[PDB]
């Protein structure tokens, strides 16, 4: 069973069920049917039964021809074919994962997207990514152009803070709906297994939210005695908790393109529709390549950005060092608000201490803290939240230095699952918390301390 | 006719003939046939006659249906369909340019490429474009990878320098073949239209270089009294001159991917094969969009590069300026050999004259150069090449300043159309030319002069 307590540990990769807008058949390396969704018969007029092998006369030669090239293939398999089965024309998408072949039958409802038309989609959307040299212009723009394309009546962009928390930094919607810019959720709104997934799968599609799931039997793969891993499965089934959530938002359909930097989910575009919605495989696949592109483009942008700040910052220290080391008045050099140490780490208030002379730039909380490290008289460095009147406190020893950050920063069934609700349970974790001390800010205070360890007079 | 005097100005966009591995039907806005290749009967049943409209029984319904989307659609039309005609299976690729609709029927010879397969060709190659930061490594890799994908007996990357000239900076070949790395051809090897075209069309295909071509009648479009513009045409026929050339190179098939920055062809991938060779439209199409991606990547990658050198460059100047503006005897401040002038623009030797004092870094020539700006006694700047003992010469007045660059840089029917015969024709353009003075160098020597125009004592 799934509650607000079993939220973060839910194995959403191995649900043993799929959404109903298609059907699943799984097979072992030799083509034998190991399991299938319970709707096959309804959808397709086969009754795939374990031990069976599919035959032209239920699945068409186009499928088997396909699957064969999968069975006699060497690497990770992925492919698909647009066959017509008895009742309907189909998008049948296969792929092998672990040691299992999945055949997912998703219902095609269109004409054929020319191998060309497909391209101008991809190219039309990539085009947006390459106009801009600013990371936020980028998101703002593509966020628009995606809507013009899909028709999804809400499409947003999310950025993910280092704490894996989440913020809505771009949006385009149908006016009727409430706006979302600036909204913040917790890391806890997207579990490590969903996040892990979104990293693996560029694109996730929820066809209908209140869908009533369709199960695969056996729920467990006899060959392996483990359940079936449906990551990389298209009709894989969505966690109920997240289904409740979307409904509490008044949403019926979904889709998300991923953005990935490092090996991490840097953020994602999320598509919402007030009614059910289904983007075809082929289109999704224009977006899959979009995502690859987008992520790259965003990665090099961001490495350049921080590379820069990182430079502007270190050039500062080094400047400050020659200035102090080459003057005799260090108190006057070290505390000039422009040659100010405050210039070095991003803070609200700072402090130079050496001898019996102090200066509170931007003094009392300092009587206490030099009293805290009294039980630690061999520390040359100090750092903390959530703590007088300022919570951020970083302290380096040479004679001391201090940097501060105060933190003025900024129906249904379950307790938390809503927009303004996840932000209500976001806040209570962040009032103890000043803007956390960047991996860069410990390196700055550190280099600086050492740097002044140098001055002999 | 086409000779070496006449190759500069050739209209390769309007030949009035295509290549034989396909067929072409041009049609006006109401779909009436205005022209057709001469092999239309040879390749297909019909005799497409100006005036005629296509009928299902000539061309299939898939094409007629396609063309219909085109005739009623509004903007640039681009599209294809895979239809069986009488004799063969085809890739009918169509598009509209100016006010004409082209229907190219290129011979399909494979099984259908799935949308998925189409997608990882794309992503496989894109993936190669986003591992590296160095502009050079990037090229070096995709060069390799394209060979692993097409099989082209040769794969290469060209780079073009601001003087519209060309260098080969990446290779992957069948070893039996001479290696081209480090070769250099003039701008004259790719005429303005070639180049301008290579910018519009990302991709070009040549299947048999000794192909005896296929005309289209009427050579001239009644509606417009001007020839048909095959700019965007796939089967567009290639200049004879470039053919005579490739065969002198012993090459029967060719394929080019564009890399574009600014509105400018920054470089390209030329693929060569020593027997005839055709890469299917759908596959072409994946490279077409790779051309988009690679082009953007390199644009940012390169703009960071130049931006840096552009920053270190100006940083130096401004460094030197505060060091003299704030210092006392300038002949020596301008002249710690490291705070030196030569350390501000790329040269081989430089010179600082003022008063009656000279110092030849890296004096006599000084009395002669001031004697050649005697007939221009009010020149504060001077710049030249091809010229004493140096041909690159740039001069600034405040007392003067000079920077130097010497020049030790580095069958058929017509003479020059050969690899080493183009490189031989190249040397003449460069034997009396030093590395030209960049837009940047004229800005440095300028800002500097201005900077030293501030000094009073
Ligand atoms: C304003 C909107 C808003 C949302 C949507 C939010 C949480 C949130 N949960 C998400 C996915 C998800 N969230 C969950 C599970 C959970 N979901 C939970 O809220 C909790 C507490 C759990 C687990 C403890 C799952 C399983 C997914 C992805 C499911 C899938 O697509 O497979 C997503 C990503 C997909 C999307 O954008 O639609 C968000 C933004 N916080 C917000 O402020
Ligand atoms: C070692 C190899 C080498 C080459 C390939 C070269 C010139 C050269 N000519 C090119 C295209 C071309 N060159 C021409 C025409 C000319 N070509 C000429 O050399 C001249 C003198 C003219 C006309 C005055 C045309 C028309 C094309 C492109 C044709 C097309 O693809 O439509 C290309 C691009 C396509 C390719 O690389 O195959 C090159 C590199 N110089 C060299 O040293």
From Swiss-Prot, chains A, B:
Record-annotated GAF domain positions: 134-298
Post-translational modification comment from the UniProt entry: Contains one covalently linked tetrapyrrole chromophore.
GO biological process, one term: osmosensory signaling via phosphorelay pathway
One annotated GO molecular function: phosphorelay response regulator activity
Binding-site residues for a tetrapyrrole, renumbered to this chain: 7
Keywords noted in UniProt: ATP-binding, Chromophore, Kinase, Nucleotide-binding, Phosphoprotein, Photoreceptor protein, Receptor, Sensory transduction, Transferase
Segments for region (Chromophore binding domain): 12-457
Catalytic activity: ATP + protein L-histidine = ADP + protein N-phospho-L-histidine
The enzyme's E.C. designation: 2.7.13.3
Family from the record: In the N-terminal section; belongs to the phytochrome family.
Physiological role: Photoreceptor which exists in two forms that are reversibly interconvertible by light: the R form that absorbs maximally in the red region of the spectrum and the FR form that absorbs maximally in the far-red region.
Protein name: Bacteriophytochrome
Interval of the full protein contained in this chain: 6 to 494 of 728
